[PDB]
Amino acid sequence: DGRGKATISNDGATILKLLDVVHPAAKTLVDIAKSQDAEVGDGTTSVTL
Amino acid sequence: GAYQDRDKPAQIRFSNISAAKAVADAIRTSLGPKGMDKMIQDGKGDVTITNDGATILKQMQVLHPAARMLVELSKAQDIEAGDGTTSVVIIAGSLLDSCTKLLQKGIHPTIISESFQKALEKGIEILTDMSRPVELSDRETLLNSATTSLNSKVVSQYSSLLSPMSVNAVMKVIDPATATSVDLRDIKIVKKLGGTIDDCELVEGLVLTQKVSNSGITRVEKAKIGLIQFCLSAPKTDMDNQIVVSDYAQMDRVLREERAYILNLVKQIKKTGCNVLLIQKSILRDALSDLALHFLNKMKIMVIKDIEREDIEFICKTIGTKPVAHIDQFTADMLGSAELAEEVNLNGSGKLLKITGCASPGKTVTIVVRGSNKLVIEEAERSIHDALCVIRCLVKKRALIAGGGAPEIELALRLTEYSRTLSGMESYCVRAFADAMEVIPSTLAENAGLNPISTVTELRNRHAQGEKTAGINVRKGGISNILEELVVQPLLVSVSALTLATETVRSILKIDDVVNTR
Amino acid sequence: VNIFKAGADEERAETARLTSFIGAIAIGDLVKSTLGPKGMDKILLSSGRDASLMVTNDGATILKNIGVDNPAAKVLVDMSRVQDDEVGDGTTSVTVLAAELLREAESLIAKKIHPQTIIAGWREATKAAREALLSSAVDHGSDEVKFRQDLMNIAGTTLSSKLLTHHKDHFTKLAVEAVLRLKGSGNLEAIHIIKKLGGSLADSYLDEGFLLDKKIGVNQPKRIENAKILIANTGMDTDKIKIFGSRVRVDSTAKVAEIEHAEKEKMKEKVERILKHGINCFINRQLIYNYPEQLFGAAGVMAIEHADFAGVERLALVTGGEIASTFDHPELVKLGSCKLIEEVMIGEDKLIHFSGVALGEACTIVLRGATQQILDEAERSLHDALCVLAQTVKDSRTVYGGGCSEMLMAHAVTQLANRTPGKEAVAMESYAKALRMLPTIIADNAGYDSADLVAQLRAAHSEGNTTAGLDMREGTIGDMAILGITESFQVKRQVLLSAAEAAEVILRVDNIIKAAPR
Amino acid sequence: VNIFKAGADEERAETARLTSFIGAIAIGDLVKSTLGPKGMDKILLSSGRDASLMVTNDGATILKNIGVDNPAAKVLVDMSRVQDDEVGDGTTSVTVLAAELLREAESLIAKKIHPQTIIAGWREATKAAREALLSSAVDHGSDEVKFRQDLMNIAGTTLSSKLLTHHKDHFTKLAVEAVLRLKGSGNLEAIHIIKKLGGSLADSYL
Amino acid sequence: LSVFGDRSTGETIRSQNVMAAASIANIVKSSLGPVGLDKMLVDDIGDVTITNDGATILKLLEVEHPAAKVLCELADLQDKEVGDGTTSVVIIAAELLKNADELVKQKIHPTSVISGYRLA
Amino acid sequence: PRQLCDNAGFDATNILNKLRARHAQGGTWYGVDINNEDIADNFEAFVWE
Amino acid sequence: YGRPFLIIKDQDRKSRLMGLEALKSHIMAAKAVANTMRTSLGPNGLDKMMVDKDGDVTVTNDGATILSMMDVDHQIAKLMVELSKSQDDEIGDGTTGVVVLAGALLEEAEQLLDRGIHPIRIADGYEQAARVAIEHLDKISDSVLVDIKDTEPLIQTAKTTLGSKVVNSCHRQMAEIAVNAVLTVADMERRDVDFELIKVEGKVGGRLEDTKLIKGVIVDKDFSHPQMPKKVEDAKIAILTCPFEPPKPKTKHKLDVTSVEDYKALQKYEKEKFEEMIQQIKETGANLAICQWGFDDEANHLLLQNNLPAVRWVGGPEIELIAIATGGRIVPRFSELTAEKLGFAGLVQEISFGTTKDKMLVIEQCKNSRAVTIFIRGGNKMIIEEAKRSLHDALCVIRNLIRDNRVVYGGGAAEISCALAVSQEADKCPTLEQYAMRAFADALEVIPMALSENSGMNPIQTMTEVRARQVKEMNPALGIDCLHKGTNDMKQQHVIETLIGKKQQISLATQMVRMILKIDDIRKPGE
Amino acid sequence: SLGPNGLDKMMVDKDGDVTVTNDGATILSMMDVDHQIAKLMVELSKSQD
Known about the structure:
This is part of a larger assembly, with 2 copies of chain A, 1 copy of chain B, 2 copies of chain C, 1 copy of chain E and 2 copies of chain G.
Chain A: H1 12-18, H2 24-39, H3 44-48
Helix pairs in contact in A: 1-2
Chain C: E1 11-12, H1 15-31, E2 41-45, E3 53-56, H2 59-65, H3 71-86, H4 91-111, H5 115-134, E4 138-139, H6 144-159, H7 168-181, E5 191-195, E6 205-206, E7 210-212, E8 224-232, E9 249-250, H8 253-275, E10 281-284, H9 290-298, E11 302-304, H10 309-319, E12 336-346, E13 349-357, E14 363-367, H11 372-394, E15 397-400, H12 404-419, H13 423-445, H14 450-463, E16 468-470, E17 477-479, H15 480-483, E18 486-488, H16 489-508, E19 511-514
Parallel strand pairs in C: 5-14, 8-10, 10-11
Antiparallel strand pairs in C: 1-19, 2-3, 4-15, 6-14, 7-13, 8-12, 12-13, 15-18, 16-17
Chain E: H1 11-28, E1 39-41, E2 49-51, H2 54-60, H3 66-81, H4 89-106, H5 110-119
Antiparallel strand pairs in E: 1-2
Helix pairs in contact in E: 1-4, 2-3, 3-4
PDB class: chaperone
Keywords: tric, cct, reovirus capsid, sigma 3, chaperone
Entry title: Human TRiC/CCT complex with reovirus outer capsid protein sigma-3
């Protein structure tokens, strides 16, 4: 973060949550990850692709 | 034991190594049949594409000193070979990588160099052993050598056409007998924007980028050529001169007489029977007169002004026609003759002068470049130029080696056991030294996208009895007989590369500090 | 109270002392690494010159290009430069030696003895030393065997410090033969030192004759045998005129027309005057117009123009020809004669070969190698290496190096330190001890344990083995006469003398004052 | 490649040694002048405290009041403050002694012997010296006449470095009587020190 | 490690060049075919220029990216060669670039791409 | 799978060309093996989702 | 089409490095940390000095402290920083080299990357190599379970663990100091020990040898009243929380005095209460009292009035240290205290430890006590601080030894056999993990080279001989003659180390470097 | 700076040039004073020398 607290991640949804998007349509993609992460987890990775 | 107080040198050394490795690894991408050309935009704003590393490096605005020597290093390799500038640097850096390896291995750098001095002596010996002596007259092997050089840059597009153009040109300019080191500048390159790289041309004759001065004379048959140095205008002395007018008949007498002077001038020229005029720059003073052109065009004589003093030897080397600087000397005895000469019309209107056929065949020759991209034309000739260079390099030594990294893996293999033979810490250095050569084949499979470690070791494993002829194939994407793939390079190429690197890194080791200056 | 303008300084005798010493110590320790047969070499880079940078081993150049503000240091930098113009290397030694003086002298400042004494005793101490050195010199006159034998011994000693050290034997002959070619003339300018990239360092050599880096004229003979040579400074391209600047004023163009012609005849006959010498080779430092050259070409006589005075010196030296003018009395002027002139191509350029030369007076060394800086510093190495070499001819007396002799001096002072009794004896100790530090530094950069060796080396000299020296390839005491580790007496004399003075001035000051910089 | 935050440093084993060493030497030579029966004293002034200033001979106070950046020197300042807690003066001696220890140690670095060995010999060299030092000790138990006679002698030795030296005899009795007042109690807080202007130094008394 | 500039490699510039090319296509994609609609440029001060021919359009347009100039350079030669196809030609190349990169965009070897492209 | 072979650095096309072809008839659960770098019944390989 | 667009705010200042270039970049950073730490290992090693932001300084050899003090900016470095912190509180020293293990592995790891080799396998093999190491290591591991009452295996181990620290001046004593300390406070029935039972106490002054563990507790408090006698022989002890004042019910409470007699009785009670508890303690038969909280100056004298010294304003943890060391209890009330709850000890005496300072109080308890303190004296504050950590760490390994009584002679022999043990497998490896094997094995080799380099000897001439002997002989007891003793039998040299120390160490390292290999891309915000 | 046992000075010129000497006039000659009476001494010695 801009705070300096580093954060590693393998789950993209987590990475995406870190990746503070400014484009709107992309945030939808980011939202999907949360849903799928709230549903089933990794492959959220895939879900984006 | 002895204690080391200072570490400023060691770290300073490491700094250079890290720089060098970074540099070589950056260049590493571009090499070999799978080499990938790069592009730079100048701070002044110029843009360049390039596949040859030397030109990359001469484009490189390197801040750190060490690679600047490496940059300098390649230029000598370029002034020596032309490709492997690609290969040589990755060799250079790879050495330092292992040279780094030995550094925390605590071995004093001095012994390393001598070990490397020994290490090179074996290799140059080995390379002599493996090479293939070949007389110069075998056109195809030259051709085999050619495309081997050529299938490293973009010109691979029309390689099959480009390679013969190159070799034939060499044959026409060389003496196939003395086996000397004939200069390339006797070969002319013509960067003509537009056209197709396929439409790049050889000229067994003379071509001048400049344009005619006659409106009406365009093509000439059985041309008798004349190259003149002394200007054709109002006679103006080196020292101060001036016509003084104080009387009546001065006007026309002056007025008439200049033309008369000009008239006899042209009159003698026509009296000589020449029909094509060559005029140099006379920027110090008057050039050809407009009036004379009126006469010469009235005399219906082909004419060209503004000929560069630098080209004049080449042209008379080309046309076999000594120039003239005084009227009396201007004589048909010196008058050159050509079967035909004229100005071609390309680029829609990018018009160019051609002179085909000369009764006196000069050894020199010119080369035409056509093609769409302006930058691609420049890169093409670079590839063409180096194509000439390697041939000349091959002209230097009638010995041949397969390209495609096989010599290197042989060497490291051959070094591997000889290192085993040699005792002392030097073995590790040579052990490392051989491991440096290990990089290049690995690079190939990288640019081949193939499993390098599996391949190259298998390349070693085969090469334990799969000697220099065999190696990794690009086209099939495996390991095969490279000789049977007709991918062959002259001995000196890697020799120069190997030799040049060796001295430099030795000089690299002797460094201990850099002091910022005024 | 404020006295000077702002930006002006006044440091009195403690701050003044220290800062003078601090930078001096910085000067020494910055450069100690570079001398010693196992020494290093430094890299110097421009602030901004597109990184005009120089790897350098010779401290003088290292001193030359470093910008230092410590005025006392600038004294030393100039001090070495004098020595550099004296002997070239040992700038390495001299400066660092003078430093330990300063470092150790400062210790006695802590001992708080009036420096006026320090001047006296060292001056006395020096007086013994130089005499002691003088007592140790060795001559070799008509003993050409041993003379030439030792002569090469001197070179390698000087040479076994620079990057070329791996090929000492090679260049030893080079410098030897070239220096002998000077026939007792000391003019290094009689040797040109041509550098060009390409080739290994080992490939560099000295021609049997002479070479030139200029262009042939129009299609004159490229190769000439049993050549008759002429040299002039009379300009041709700059048409010979009458300096005052007379006008030429004429009513009619006919008058100027014939005058242009008249100049032509004036020009033409001048050549025929040249030709009356029956000479097939002519040269000039002037640029020469092509029209006379055509007359020379009309003669089938080759000539080269515009080769600067220095080479002209070389040519006259190598060929015995007398550079001339107006050529009025061919019998009163001696031409130059050589067996052969031919055009040979090196690296990328054709160079002008002079085979079978009349006089070996002039010479030129081929430099093939790896790096501009490598070639540059290799150049730097030899010029000094010749520089000592000529003085060796100039003064054919020698001393053994390898630190031993310096120890002999120190021991001699060590004895006279006792005949002193007084405060000076301490300075006697100081002075002698400082000298002993030098070989210690050499043993330092060789990485062997200095401490015992100097102590042992002191023992044998204190015993009296004046020839026992130091091993640089194994690190121990040894017989320099067996090992030929010798150098010019004059060198180390200036070494001692200059540092002694350098010591004097640095101590005598007790206040620095800087004006406000503009 | 940059690693730390801006304004952070990393000096290794030449720069680290160098700057460390000069500071210690500066510290020593800053304090050498003050010791000795013919010793001198310095002035230390607050930057601004209405110029709270103290002319001083006892270096620990001088060491206390100096702001130093060299941490090794800052190490040394800690060193003396302990010593002042113990014996008060000789901080003088300790301070300069270590620096010259250091200065010469640098010469061994100039002599280029590994510091680890440099440690070993000194530790051993320390070990014997104190042993010999102890062997040189001289006790004085019940020998009150010599004891008291020696007792005053120690003070004057200590006293013959501060400004009271021109009156070493006077205060000699002062503290001697003062100390004899303690009946073996080690609590100096039992002694009060009233100070007030007026009168000569000799006029000061118990 | 170069002063006064970094570098970009691999997909980054690869993708970047595609964006450059496609943009130029989108610059002129509306000026072609019997229904082509002409382009026009307010210069900087009102000396405008309506035109549908790309070579003029490209020539009159400031460009900074290299490869775009190449197409910009390329068209003029065709202008020096044909006169139209300015309706077409540049659109062809970048599209030929477009799909070509896409194969590369997975892994595909460019020189492998070239040969068939040459064959094409 | 294409991403996999990229993240495995494999010639996914040849694998894919093998993949689809072998997936014409020969068995449903054939799929990428990282270590064998090619097709396998990941199901019997217990790659189960 | 082509035109600028925003995906993340500050997209300009969102820099990003990906893949191999980032990979090596981290490797470059890693080596710096490695080269930062190399000198810090071993008896011949040399320790570092850190400078605090508030201008303070610290010299130390414990790399955990070194990094804890270190302020980096590179993120991976912080991972290394906490990494060592994770190792230290896990085991202790060895941190002297823990990171050095990692980066050299990473340094050579890049060599595989320079061979284009994918990190995932590189992650794979090294872990397998790690498992290889431990099962080899514990096989050749010695044990001190087989030992009798472990008096001087530990002393050697303590001696070993202190040879890396500057307190090595008299470390033999401190080796004894700790071992007594730990054995007293250990629960063999548990294989654990709480460090709270240990009271570190270092006061500057005196020599290092003046450092002295105290079978008891020392108090940084003097007497409640100055006239109270400094020494006390008997140790009938009272441990109190309720400060010696009128009790006040902490619910909002207040009295509402009205009449004269209202004033007097309270005034009467005011003293009467003090006599009560003064009587109360007196009836308990204690000899000494101690209170956590305040006193009234009045009853204090009254408490002095009955020759019952007490201590006021005693910090919490210590009071129980007093209580348990005395075996004593903590009573909050005057009435409810009885003699049974009273503490007893051997001796209590305040010490005027400082020549010019206020004093300290020590309790020389003479019975058994599960808590104990160590008193440190010495010449420098940082020297105290170095000692504490060094002393603190030495405790842990013995505690660590308590958990596992099987150790190995240190000095570099241990892992040396492993790489050889690793290497022997590398022939039966098969493929590219085969390269992975020798890589890590080659990676492991550095630690002895660190030693001998810090020993100033030829690192390689040393270990090459060292291997061959451990190649020629089967004894895995030949390390580095660190103190220049011609015997490589470190077992006889007694340089020993717990199995776990290395065992956790490298095992820890493997997982970290696995993540280190695991990452490729970073998006750094512009500062 | 006076006398055989005297000890002399080193001056630094505005343009970075240096000079070591004992001649007091020259000493004052290189000196850049600002105080007026000081200049009188400078010329004083100069006139004297």
